[PDB]
């Protein structure tokens, strides 16, 4: 009734939104990317993502696959367990498709609370 439905999704876009730079950088001196906080790693070549999973009190942060190397699809996900009602358990997906470097978002949220630039 009083929840914060489209505030609550524009806080988690801006969580994982960022991390597309993250894991182009990367990418781009053919190092992997790794889940979570941490240093770089010389020897394996690995990132880390920089970010803490529960960064967002909304919900969880995750990364497939884990490592990632950029000759595979990478997906950067927001699970919205820590939502309202009409949020709660919704998931919000940004995916980078490794035969062209391209970004997409897409949620499963209710079409009202699904923010800019993201579809169904």
Same mark, same amino acid.
């Given at each position: 009734?009083?929840?914060?439905?489209?505030?609550?999704?524009?806080?988690?876009?801006?969580?994982?939104?960022?991390?597309?730079?993250?894991?182009?950088?990367?990418?781009?001196?053919?190092?992997?990317?790794?889940?979570?906080?941490?240093?770089?790693?010389?020897?394996?070549?690995?990132?880390?993502? !920089?970010? @803490?999973?529960?960064? $967002? +009190?909304?919900?969880? &942060?995750? #990364?497939?696959?884990?490592? /990632? *190397? =950029?000759?595979?699809?990478?997906?950067?996900?927001?699970?919205? !367990?820590? @939502?309202?009602?009409? $949020? +709660?358990?919704?998931? &919000?997906? #940004?995916?980078?498709?490794? /035969? *062209? =470097?391209?970004?997409?978002?897409?949620?499963?949220?209710?079409?009202?609370?699904?923010?800019?630039?993201?579809?169904?």
């Amino acid at each position: 009734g009083t929840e914060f439905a489209r505030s609550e999704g524009a806080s988690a876009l801006a969580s994982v939104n960022p991390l597309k730079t993250t894991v182009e950088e990367a990418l781009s001196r053919g190092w992997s990317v790794k889940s979570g906080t941490g240093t770089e790693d010389a020897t394996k070549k690995e990132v880390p993502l !920089g970010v @803490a999973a529960d960064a $967002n +009190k909304l919900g969880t &942060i995750a #990364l497939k696959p884990d490592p /990632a *190397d =950029g000759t595979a699809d990478i997906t950067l996900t927001f699970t919205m !367990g820590g @939502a309202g009602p009409k $949020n +709660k358990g919704k998931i &919000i997906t #940004l995916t980078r498709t490794a /035969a *062209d =470097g391209l970004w997409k978002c897409t949620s499963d949220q209710d079409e009202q609370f699904i923010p800019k630039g993201c579809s169904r």
